């Protein structure tokens, strides 16, 4: 079981691009908590690490500056979203975190077929590649938009799914 | 797979069936370390043969052997992979009675470890690369 | 926006001699339409004492 | 082949056998601690029996 | 119009021509616009939207009279018991097919933008069978054993099923549920063993320099045909797409270099060359023919399908394989 | 709020007490109220009668009594107690030599009583024992899979109450008998039973040449004694064939009722099938020193009959519900009780040998703990006894009717293929063919059908109406499956004038297969189309328009349907909803006609015609086993008239005495910007405004203290290193003050040991409002703690979780949905009158699943929205399309009538939608916009305007109230994110935390995923730095904190550790390079 | 630096004692009054290494200024505490005992 | 997707070589604090804050754009690791 991770009920996020996905502010916070402490060290929010975690200690401790720092650190970073059970290589895919209201993972509608994920109560684990090496290969070969074709068949596993085909066909 | 509408590339299946067609039995031990009935990989018996036949020794009459996926995965040189399946006592035992040069050549072989798996990044061909700029390479060129 | 009932510690409590629980009471209170005559006024605390 | 019989039994590191205090002072030790414990309980009782020179049986 | 297949090959050809990033932005554009137009479209399922063809009624007349005559053929006894039940099965299979065909025909003829029809036709959601069960008569349902019930659920989902019809429905329904849920735990049953045998195979060499190649036959002698027939369209692709040639291949007056990675276009012109009969087999590098002790060279494997370029040397092709083969195990 | 009744078919009898399958059964087992003189030989009494008298000193049985429960159900749930009754038994002991008679009543511990609602309370946990499916006792013949033309006999007793005896006929023709995996000529055992060759040859001789195959001259040359000896040699080789011990083996194997107990129902099966009778529940008996058979001869007789093909004989379907018993709660209870009593008998056998032979009483002998331990084991740690689905009253109601194939004395998971899982033809009216739990373990947990009930025999019986000629009769015969296959039973769908059938042709069901018959050919009739399914499935409207799979999921989701603060009874229901609440005993009713003197939220006191004053304490927000709050809200005004069997106060998930698992909301079925994608559900913030879908959930937290030598633990407010502001919501006792609002991190209960703090704070996942706290100190009045526990303090923290983004919504028709984006009232599709849609549903979720029940329910939700009336649409016996269109016509006239009355013409946007629809061909072309909208509304569709665009949604969409309900699978319980997490002590992987969460299982499949990706750095980091590794995780946290993007795992911790582990077993595991240079992987240090 | 292969093989008593850094001559472990290890126990720092990073038992040397140094007072090397997951011990046997694997694993290697 | 990921995959013989190059370059960029960048001031990846535009904190993006410029040279055994590190650290603290 992994440390730097998360999970929640998944929700379709139409607004977010393929290289990104919607993370709950709670989830986005806890996932990148140390990252948040670092960027808050960079900005004028918290003195040091201890005071930074103490600034993230309770629920009302949250503030505009803090969420802004989060938005700053997840900018250019990605999270490895994964659906249960993992059946193939695209069973996990990287997405640039995008803060979203609520407490549920906002997943891209396209990768659903690739995740074999349906929004009927499905829960997806999420992870963060801490190392810039790990972070790199995440947003290079594990990025959803970088694995458009299925490694199994060569067929696009990121093709327009149900609702999209409906609209376009209409 | 076609029957169920599933179309996956023949490549992958070729990979697995290759990994099943890798071991061969021995008809005649010859001048080798092997003996009649011993199970080892095709490439290794070919290397052993080409080493013995270029030495002046009688090669191994290898009999092509096909074993199942789990039977191929059970009789592997990777005694880590094998001692991660069942009766690891036996695997480690039979592998320790003979000083076994277990190359870290497998992903399962190396996950137990923790090192960069010989895959993608962790591949030796790719892992060992360097990045530089002209402002650095000029200074490099100066002292060298 | 707020409700305090005497001898009621939380929303999920229920008041003796009262049919509706504090939950349903608050539910009914959400339907309360309060007109502020004065635009500058932004808060009013209405009281209510009833028995029998 | 003589190496199969070991006249010296290696002991695994302490941390890999964490005799540690869990909830409510409950020391939840690994089974290996008690295993080596019994092994010495027989070993020293064998060396001391060699010193004593206890009867064969 | 744009359906699942058209958009599929669209994203694919965009991916191999325009590139990854432009294809991703393409994907999000198709998403945003397709969505805004999905809510603009006002596609909606109504009971009246689930249009029942008059052809269904007609077909029930025809199926009934024919099955009655069949029972007369059982009274005469030219058939056996199994062949009576098979004249029932044969009847209801083609009955369900004719009813379905009637459903979609009646749709595209009278209701082209019918929600059910546009969903099924686009490949958005549904398939011929499900729309058939919805609109036309529900297909024949199975007995507890292997046999199928003589009486099908002829009542549509729009009219409503009879109680007993719902029971005999629940038979095959619970069977299907028992089949789809049994593989949930076995989802990694294959993939495990496969990994156990394919964990040690990756792309180590850019080219093992093996002269050896496999020759995938573009022609398979289909058992039912007993002739050198051109094999299935998808089979050639899955057996040739993204693959290096050990021998140069000259087809359609076009040169495929010795050591060239084949594309889907290349495979397509190879198939067109096969229809004209230019080559029966293709001399192509394969993992089977690689000399690497624990792995496959870049040439022997071929294209990396995930990014539609030559396989990145070092790729866990073996685990990619184990997962590619183990993933659809649930669907099997 | 008025109700419109649909369906012409009348339920000739009301549903049975839906809990009686458990209630009547367990009461049949107990017979507490029944005096010892009139207690039937069933259940507890049956076990006493089977076990006693112990024939060594003769310990006999006189009677037994069941005392009143030490505590009420409330206090039992309150203090981790079993709602049990003190079991007593008056026994008499008679010295066979002296003739003296001693008698005494022995306290045999306690026996878990069953509540009025059919459930139990074991260790304070509401637990229901699901009835078990198993191959009924008796005799069953089944075709030999290896030998076609022959049949295998099989005598099967009660589970664990004897071996399976199989009478198999070989190609030679000799009769064989298989017991304990041993085969031997039955001839022998027959001779053992004092049978002449003559008796066999005369009893069987008319059946064929096989009887000659029975004949064995060596067996018949020796008297029954020697044949018995020979048999004992055959079954126990090596064991000396001494006469008495051999007789003891045969007797114990067959003639002894204590060792071999064939079921009473199995006795009825043997009796009815073979056409004979049993003196007792034994295959044979021991009389006057010789064996006398009871079962073998008739079984072999029917066997040779079936082999020869004698008419009146049939082969047995082992999955026939007339051949497959339902071990109900009472039977299972008294079976583990029977085993317990057997161990009492053996224990006594060990007692009578020790001490004074003369000085003995029915006390000194009795050892009650094998019994108590048996019962307690069966109620606590059995698979048939599970946590009561208290999510909603219906969930419990079905968990009671839930029937499992698993459990002790039944089937395993591998002993059950499709053969057992597949619905048999006899489940009709007896078992819901739809209520099987989805996913794994499917087909095994078939729930009981609605009108179905279990007899004394354990066979499911369904009610039918015997008919006379063409005329049907009000007479209701309850039939087992075995009887049903002998008659013709017409459907309830057929048109009936009063009684009499008026149909020339009638759809009927005969012995499983559907046949069209004449009225005179009709014999019986389905009581109602509701009898076929469980209660859950029966609550689903328009089920005949729903797919069996999706209605399986709907019926199953009914179990996890969550009660809400404004839980509204469905706009479209089946009429079974009204029965549910009173049968679930969720809502309290009136016991007599009278006036309600006192009306209160806590209690409702009523004055009856008797003049008696009856107080009803309302269960207010009691924490369910599944989390949802069980509350009871009054519905009768203060001082008003009430009749007998009338509602006094609503139950959980109930409105006006109906079942309200959720709230019907104005649903518009359309895609919305992809927000409703793949079953996702868009929702108006208007629903959150009026607090629709607001689930009250109570989580149970607890702290238990133990005593250590450095210092024990105590529940106190005095908690070290913590501010008073942090203890703001804690009272003096350390308990969180009732009414406080706690958050993740806040303290609930104090506890200190060695002084450092080890108190449990509010878990990171759940937090909210406290409604009730329970303080259980050591040795409190009627409180039982675990050994070593100094005190148990249990806080019940509630909260009203609204419908946030992600929560699992679903209708009754299997539309599992997830809250997409709670769009405000503005940017949501809305009616031309201005009415904003409550819920946007993805239409895609309808075709593939083939469940039009949601569509129809929407179409009626419309009419019910504009006519202000809810509808009762019985399953199958529900309103078809035409009546719905008529309803939609009247409701249309209400809808457009206001606009027409005010002086409003048709909207240009409306006419535009009518243009797009005329192009679509939904509405008729050429007619006036009012008539166009008329026909359009008939289609259950309305002109809807996109609130964000304003432009009318081209192509009209279906709208209408749908009884969507919130499910137990809500988000806040599932959300689970974490930077780091306190690592387990047994393994340095992260598991849980006081302020943080618990680690995320990175399964081997995900490992393969990262492998395939070639993300070796990500994988290395994942398994080591992000988990198993400590020395690298410190570097991870520290470097990421300092902003260093390169956490360094130069050497794998798992590898060096592995190397050392391998070395520990004296196996050298040297690491070498290509040069074979020993590369120190420990980087020195070794 | 690049571990290309890993060789498993049988270990002679010499190699067995090679990785060992002290003979566990006591069945003793952590007591209640003191959380420190007992005399030459399974957790003794004189055999397996220091509980704390770069700090001996008694506490004469407490920093990285000393590394590889063995304290003359308690007999503990001043290295990283993490070595207590690595450093090995040994148990000298009066009578040499056969490894139960090679004995009971089928087929019996010794046999 | 990532900007110029196509050209990036084209520059390398292996997508994973792109991975290691971008990664190691990002490690250099963070160890040196972006002062060793080959990106011109105008080519610096920007980010929108409540204050205004700031430099992109993520080193991976920086490395990928730097690689898109082609001003970076990648290959096996370009320079001994010790001398490389010491030179890059000599130019930048
Ligand atoms: Mg799902
Ligand atoms: Zn190759
Ligand atoms: Zn010291």
From Swiss-Prot, chain A:
<feature type="binding site">
    <location>
        <position position="120"/>
    </location>
    <ligand>
        <name>Mg(2+)</name>
    </ligand>
</feature>
<feature type="binding site">
    <location>
        <position position="118"/>
    </location>
    <ligand>
        <name>Mg(2+)</name>
    </ligand>
</feature>
<feature type="binding site">
    <location>
        <position position="122"/>
    </location>
    <ligand>
        <name>Mg(2+)</name>
    </ligand>
</feature>
<comment type="function">
    <text>DNA-dependent RNA polymerase catalyzes the transcription of DNA into RNA using the four ribonucleoside triphosphates as substrates.</text>
</comment>
<comment type="similarity">
    <text>Belongs to the RNA polymerase beta' chain family.</text>
</comment>
<comment type="subunit">
    <text>The RNAP catalytic core consists of 2 alpha, 1 beta, 1 beta' and 1 omega subunit. When a sigma factor is associated with the core the holoenzyme is formed, which can initiate transcription.</text>
</comment>
<protein>
    <recommendedName>
        <fullName>DNA-directed RNA polymerase subunit beta'</fullName>
    </recommendedName>
</protein>
UniProtKB/Swiss-Prot annotation, chain B:
<comment type="subunit">
    <text>The RNAP catalytic core consists of 2 alpha, 1 beta, 1 beta' and 1 omega subunit. When a sigma factor is associated with the core the holoenzyme is formed, which can initiate transcription.</text>
</comment>
<comment type="similarity">
    <text>Belongs to the RNA polymerase beta' chain family.</text>
</comment>
<protein>
    <recommendedName>
        <fullName>DNA-directed RNA polymerase subunit beta'</fullName>
    </recommendedName>
</protein>
<comment type="function">
    <text>DNA-dependent RNA polymerase catalyzes the transcription of DNA into RNA using the four ribonucleoside triphosphates as substrates.</text>
</comment>
Swiss-Prot record, chain F:
<dbReference type="GO" id="GO:0003899">
    <property type="term" value="F:DNA-directed RNA polymerase activity"/>
</dbReference>
<dbReference type="InterPro" id="IPR007644">
    <property type="entry name" value="RNA_pol_bsu_protrusion"/>
</dbReference>
<dbReference type="Pfam" id="PF10385">
    <property type="entry name" value="RNA_pol_Rpb2_45"/>
</dbReference>
<dbReference type="GO" id="GO:0032549">
    <property type="term" value="F:ribonucleoside binding"/>
</dbReference>
<dbReference type="InterPro" id="IPR007120">
    <property type="entry name" value="DNA-dir_RNAP_su2_dom"/>
</dbReference>
<dbReference type="InterPro" id="IPR042107">
    <property type="entry name" value="DNA-dir_RNA_pol_bsu_ext_1_sf"/>
</dbReference>
<dbReference type="InterPro" id="IPR037034">
    <property type="entry name" value="RNA_pol_Rpb2_2_sf"/>
</dbReference>
<dbReference type="InterPro" id="IPR007121">
    <property type="entry name" value="RNA_pol_bsu_CS"/>
</dbReference>
<keyword id="KW-0808">Transferase</keyword>
<comment type="subunit">
    <text>The RNAP catalytic core consists of 2 alpha, 1 beta, 1 beta' and 1 omega subunit. When a sigma factor is associated with the core the holoenzyme is formed, which can initiate transcription.</text>
</comment>
<dbReference type="InterPro" id="IPR007641">
    <property type="entry name" value="RNA_pol_Rpb2_7"/>
</dbReference>
<dbReference type="GO" id="GO:0003677">
    <property type="term" value="F:DNA binding"/>
</dbReference>
UniProtKB/Swiss-Prot annotation, chain H:
<protein>
    <recommendedName>
        <fullName>DNA-directed RNA polymerase subunit omega</fullName>
        <ecNumber>2.7.7.6</ecNumber>
    </recommendedName>
</protein>
<keyword id="KW-0240">DNA-directed RNA polymerase</keyword>
<comment type="subunit">
    <text>The RNAP catalytic core consists of 2 alpha, 1 beta, 1 beta' and 1 omega subunit. When a sigma factor is associated with the core the holoenzyme is formed, which can initiate transcription.</text>
</comment>
<dbReference type="InterPro" id="IPR006110">
    <property type="entry name" value="Pol_omega/Rpo6/RPB6"/>
</dbReference>
<dbReference type="GO" id="GO:0006351">
    <property type="term" value="P:DNA-templated transcription"/>
</dbReference>
<comment type="function">
    <text>Promotes RNA polymerase assembly. Latches the N- and C-terminal regions of the beta' subunit thereby facilitating its interaction with the beta and alpha subunits.</text>
</comment>
<dbReference type="GO" id="GO:0003677">
    <property type="term" value="F:DNA binding"/>
</dbReference>
<keyword id="KW-0808">Transferase</keyword>
<keyword id="KW-0804">Transcription</keyword>
<keyword id="KW-0548">Nucleotidyltransferase</keyword>
<comment type="similarity">
    <text>Belongs to the RNA polymerase subunit omega family.</text>
</comment>
<dbReference type="Pfam" id="PF01192">
    <property type="entry name" value="RNA_pol_Rpb6"/>
</dbReference>
């Amino acid at each position: 079981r992994v440390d730097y991770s998360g999970r929640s009920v998944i929700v379709v996020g139409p607004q977010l691009k393929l290289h990104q996905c919607g993370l709950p502010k709670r989830m986005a916070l806890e996932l990148f908590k140390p990252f948040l402490l670092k960027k808050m060290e960079e900005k004028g929010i918290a003195p040091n690490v201890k005071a930074a975690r103490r600034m993230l200690e309770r629920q009302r401790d949250i503030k505009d500056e803090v969420w802004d720092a989060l938005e700053e650190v997840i900018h250019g970073k990605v999270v490895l979203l994964n659906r249960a059970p993992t059946l193939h290589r695209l069973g996990i895919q990287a997405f640039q975190p995008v803060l979203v209201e609520g407490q549920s993972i906002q997943l891209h509608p396209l990768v659903c077929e690739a995740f074999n994920a349906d929004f009927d109560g499905d829960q997806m684990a999420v992870h963060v590649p801490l190392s810039s090496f790990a972070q790199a290969e995440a947003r290079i070969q594990m990025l959803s938009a970088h694995n458009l074709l299925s490694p199994a068949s060569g067929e696009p596993l990121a093709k327009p799914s149900r609702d999209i085909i409906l609209g376009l066909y209409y | 797979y076609r029957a169920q509408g599933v179309k996956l590339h023949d490549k992958h299946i070729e990979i697995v069936v290759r990994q099943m067609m890798k071991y061969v039995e021995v008809t005649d031990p010859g001048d080798s370390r092997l003996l009649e009935g011993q199970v080892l990989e095709k490439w290794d018996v070919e290397a052993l043969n080409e080493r013995l036949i270029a030495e002046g020794k009688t090669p191994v009459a290898w009999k092509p052997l096909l074993m199942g996926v789990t039977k191929s995965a059970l009789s592997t040189k990777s005694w880590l992979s094998a001692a991660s399946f069942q009766n690891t006592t036996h695997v480690l035992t039979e592998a320790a009675i003979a000083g076994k040069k277990d190359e870290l050549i497998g992903l399962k072989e190396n996950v137990i470890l923790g090192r960069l798996i010989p895959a993608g990044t962790g591949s030796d061909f790719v892992r060992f690369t360097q990045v530089v700029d002209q402002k650095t390479l000029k200074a490099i060129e100066e002292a060298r | 926006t707020s409700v305090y009932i005497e001898d009621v510690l939380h929303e999920f409590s229920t008041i003796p001699g009262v049919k509706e629980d504090v939950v349903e009471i608050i539910l009914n209170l959400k339907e309360l339409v309060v007109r502020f005559l004065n635009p500058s006024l932004q808060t009013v605390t209405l009281l209510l004492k009833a028995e029998g | 082949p003589e190496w199969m019989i070991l006249e010296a039994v290696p002991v695994l590191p302490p941390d890999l056998r964490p005799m540690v205090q869990v909830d409510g002072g409950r020391f939840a030790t690994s089974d290996l601690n008690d295993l080596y414990r019994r092994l010495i309980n027989r070993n020293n009782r064998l060396k001391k029996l060699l010193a004593q020179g206890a009867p064969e049986i | 119009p744009q359906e699942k297949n058209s958009l599929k090959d669209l994203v694919y050809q965009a991916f191999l021509r325009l590139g990854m990033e432009k294809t991703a932005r393409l994907l999000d554009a198709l998403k945003y616009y397709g969505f805004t137009f999905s809510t603009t479209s006002g596609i909606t399922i109504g009971i009246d939207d689930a249009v029942i063809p008059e052809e269904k009624k007609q077909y029930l007349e025809e199926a009934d009279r024919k099955l009655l005559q069949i029972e007369q053929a059982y009274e005469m006894g030219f058939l056996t018991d199994r062949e009576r039940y098979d004249q029932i099965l044969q009847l209801w299979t083609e009955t369900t097919e004719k009813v379905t065909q009637a459903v979609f025909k009646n749709f595209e003829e009278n209701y082209p933008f019918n929600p059910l029809y546009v969903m099924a036709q686009s490949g958005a959601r549904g398939n011929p069978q499900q729309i058939r069960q919805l609109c036309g008569l529900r297909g024949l349902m199975q007995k507890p054993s292997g046999e199928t019930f003589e009486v099908p659920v002829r009542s549509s989902f729009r009219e409503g099923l009879t109680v007993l019809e719902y029971f005999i429905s629940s038979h095959g329904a619970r069977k299907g549920g028992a089949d789809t849920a049994l593989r949930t735990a076995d989802s990694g049953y294959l993939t495990r063993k496969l990994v156990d045998v394919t964990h040690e195979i990756v792309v180590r060499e850019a080219d093992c320099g093996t002269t050896n190649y496999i020759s995938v036959p573009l022609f398979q002698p289909d058992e039912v045909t007993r002739s050198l027939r051109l094999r299935k369209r998808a089979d050639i692709e899955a057996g040739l797409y993204g693959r290096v040639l050990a021998r140069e291949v000259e087809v359609l007056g076009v040169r495929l270099e010795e050591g060239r990675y084949l594309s889907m276009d290349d495979v397509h012109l190879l198939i067109k060359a096969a229809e004209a009969g230019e080559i029966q087999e293709v001399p192509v590098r394969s993992p089977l023919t690689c000399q690497t002790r624990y792995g496959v060279c870049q040439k022997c494997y071929g294209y990396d399908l995930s990014m539609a370029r030559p396989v990145s040397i070092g790729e866990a092709v073996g685990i990619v394989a184990a997962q590619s083969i183990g993933e659809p195990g649930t669907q099997l | 709020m008025e109700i419109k009744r649909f369906g012409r078919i009348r339920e000739v009898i009301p549903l049975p007490p839906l809990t009686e399958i458990q209630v009547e059964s367990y009461r049949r087992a107990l017979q507490a109220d029944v005096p010892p003189e009139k207690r039937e030989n069933v259940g507890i009494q049956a076990a006493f009668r089977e076990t006693f008298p112990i024939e060594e000193l003769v310990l006999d049985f006189l009677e037994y009594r069941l005392g009143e429960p030490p505590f009420p159900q409330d206090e039992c749930r309150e203090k981790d107690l079993t709602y049990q009754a003190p079991l007593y038994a008056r026994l008499q002991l008679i010295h066979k030599d002296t003739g003296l008679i001693k008698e005494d009543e022995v306290f045999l511990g306690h026996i878990p009583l069953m509540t009025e609602d059919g459930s139990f309370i074991i260790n304070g946990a509401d637990r229901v024992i699901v009835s078990q499916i198993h191959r009924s006792p008796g005799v069953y013949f089944t075709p030999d899979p290896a030998r076609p033309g022959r049949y295998i006999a099989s005598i099967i007793p009660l589970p664990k109450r004897g071996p399976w005896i199989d009478l198999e006929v070989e190609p030679n023709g000799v009769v064989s008998m298989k017991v304990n995996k041993r085969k031997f000529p039955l001839v022998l055992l027959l001779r053992v039973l004092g049978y002449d060759q003559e008796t066999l040859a005369r009893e069987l001789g008319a059946y064929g040449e096989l009887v000659q195959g029975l004949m064995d001259e060596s067996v018949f040359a020796m008297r029954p004694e020697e044949a018995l000896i020979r048999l004992f040699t055959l079954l126990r080789p090596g064991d000396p064939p001494k006469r008495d011990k051999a007789v003891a083996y045969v007797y114990g194997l067959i003639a002894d009722p204590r060792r071999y107990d064939l079921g009473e129902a199995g006795r009825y099966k043997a009796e009815e099938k073979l056409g004979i009778r049993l003196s007792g529940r034994t295959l044979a008996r021991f009389e006057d020193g010789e064996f006398k058979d009871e079962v073998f001869l008739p079984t072999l007789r029917y066997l040779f009959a079936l082999t020869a093909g004698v008419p009146g004989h049939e082969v047995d379907d082992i999955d026939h519900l007339g051949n497959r018993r339902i071990r109900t709660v009472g039977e299972l209870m008294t079976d583990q009780f029977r085993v317990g009593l057997a161990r009492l008998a053996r224990g006594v056998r060990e007692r009578m040998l020790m001490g004074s032979e003369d000085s003995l009483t029915p006390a000194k002998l009795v050892n009650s703990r094998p019994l108590e331990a048996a019962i307690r084991e069966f109620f606590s740690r059995s698979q048939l006894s599970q946590f009561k689905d208290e999510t909603n009253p219906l969930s419990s109601l079905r968990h009671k009717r839930r029937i499992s194939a698993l459990g002790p004395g039944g089937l395993t998971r591998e002993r059950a293929g499709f053969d057992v899982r597949d619905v048999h033809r006899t489940h009709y009216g007896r078992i819901c063919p739809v209520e099987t739990p989805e996913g794994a373990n499917i087909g095994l947990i078939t729930s009981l059908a609605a009108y179905a009930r279990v007899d004394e025999l354990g066979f499911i019986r369904t009610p039918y109406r015997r008919v006379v000629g063409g005329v049907v009769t009000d007479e209701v015969v309850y039939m087992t499956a075995t009887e049903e296959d002998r008659y013709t039973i017409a459907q309830a769908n057929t048109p009936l004038e009063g009684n009499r059938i008026a149909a020339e042709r009638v759809v009927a069901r005969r012995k499983g297969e559907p046949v069209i018959v004449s009225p005179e050919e009709v014999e019986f009739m389905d009581v109602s189309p509701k009898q076929v399914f469980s209660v859950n499935t029966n609550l689903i409207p328009f089920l005949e328009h729903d797919d069996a799979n999706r209605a399986l999921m709907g019926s199953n989701m009914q179990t996890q349907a969550v009660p809400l603060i404004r839980a509204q009874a469905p706009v479209v229901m089946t009429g079974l909803e009204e029965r549910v609440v009173r049968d679930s005993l969720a809502a309290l009713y009136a016991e007599e006609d009278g006036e309600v003197a006192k009306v209160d939220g806590n209690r409702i006191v009523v004055r009856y015609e008797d003049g008696r004053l009856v107080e009803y304490p309302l269960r207010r927000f009691y924490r369910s086993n599944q989390g949802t709050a069980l509350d009871q809200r009054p519905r009768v005004v203060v001082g008003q008239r009430v009749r007998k069997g009338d509602l006094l106060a609503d139950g959980p998930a109930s409105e006006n005495g109906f079942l309200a698992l959720g709230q019907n909301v104005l649903v518009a079925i359309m895609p919305f910007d992809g927000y409703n994608f793949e079953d996702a559900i868009v929702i108006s913030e208007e629903l959150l405004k009026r607090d629709f879908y607001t689930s009250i959930h109570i989580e149970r937290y607890e702290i238990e203290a133990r005593d250590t030598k450095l210092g024990p633990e105590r529940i106190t407010r005095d908690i070290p290193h913590l501010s008073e502001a942090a203890l703001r919501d804690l009272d003096e006792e350390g308990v969180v003050r009732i009414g406080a609002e706690v958050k993740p991190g806040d303290i609930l209960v104090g506890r200190t040991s060695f002084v450092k703090d080890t108190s449990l704070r509010v878990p990171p996942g759940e937090g909210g409002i406290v409604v009730r706290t329970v303080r259980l100190r050591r040795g409190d009045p009627g409180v039982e703690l675990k050994p070593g526990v100094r005190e148990v303090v249990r806080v019940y923290v509630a909260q009203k979780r609204k419908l946030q983004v992600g929560d699992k919504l679903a209708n009754r028709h299997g539309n599992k949905g997830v809250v997409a984006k709670i769009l405000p009232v503005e940017d949501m599709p809305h009616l031309p009158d201005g009415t904003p849609v409550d819920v946007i549903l993805n239409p895609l979720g309808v075709p593939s699943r083939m469940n039009l029940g949601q569509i129809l329910e929407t179409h009626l939700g419309l009419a019910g929205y504009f006519l202000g009336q809810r509808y009762i649409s019985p399953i199958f016996d529900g309103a078809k399309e035409p009546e719905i269109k008529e309803l939609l016509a009247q409701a249309f006239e209400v809808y457009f009538g206001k606009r027409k009355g005010e002086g409003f013409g048709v909207d240009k946007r409306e006419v535009e939608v009518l243009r797009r629809a005329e192009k679509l061909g939904l509405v008729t072309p050429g007619k006036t916009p009012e008539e166009q909208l008329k026909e359009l509304f008939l289609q259950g569709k309305v002109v809807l305007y996109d609130g964000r665009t304003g432009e009318p949604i081209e192509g009209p969409i279906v709208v209408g109230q749908m009884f969507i309900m919130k499910l137990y699978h809500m988000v806040e319980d599932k959300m689970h994110a974490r930077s780091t997490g306190p690592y387990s002590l047994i393994t340095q992987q992260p598991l849980g935390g006081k302020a943080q969460f618990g680690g995320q299982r990175f399964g081997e499949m995900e490992v393969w995923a990262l492998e395939a990706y070639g993300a070796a750095h990500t994988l290395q980091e994942m398994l080591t730095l992000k988990s198993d590794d400590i020395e690298g995780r410190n570097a991870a946290y520290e470097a990421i904190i300092k902003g260093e993007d390169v956490p360094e795992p130069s050497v794998p911790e798992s590898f060096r550790v592995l190397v050392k582990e391998l070395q520990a077993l004296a196996l050298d595991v040297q690491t070498l390079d290509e040069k074979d240079n020993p590369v120190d992987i420990f980087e020195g240090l070794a | 630096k690049e571990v290309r292969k890993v060789r498993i093989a049988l270990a002679s008593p010499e190699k067995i004692r090679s990785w060992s850094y002290g003979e566990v001559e006591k069945p003793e472990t952590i007591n209640y009054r003191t959380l420190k290890p007992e005399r030459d126990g399974l957790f003794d720092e004189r055999i397996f290494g220091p509980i704390k990073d770069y700090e001996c038992a008694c506490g004469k040397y407490k920093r990285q200024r000393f590394e590889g140094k063995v304290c003359e007072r308690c007999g503990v090397e001043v290295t990283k505490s993490i070595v207590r997951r690595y450093r090995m011990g040994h148990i000298e046997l009066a009578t040499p005992a056969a490894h139960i694997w090679f004995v009971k694993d089928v087929p019996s290697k010794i046999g | 997707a990532e900007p110029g990921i196509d050209k990036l995959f084209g520059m390398v013989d292996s997508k994973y070589r792109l991975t290691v190059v971008v990664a190691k370059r990002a490690q250099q960029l963070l160890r040196h604090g972006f002062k060793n960048t080959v990106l011109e001031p105008e080519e610096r990846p920007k980010m929108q804050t409540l204050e205004g535009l700031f430099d992109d904190p993520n080193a991976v993006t920086w490395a990928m754009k730097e690689l898109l410029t082609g001003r970076l040279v990648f290959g096996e055994n370009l320079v001994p690791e010790d001398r490389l590190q010491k030179e890059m650290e000599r130019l930048y603290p």
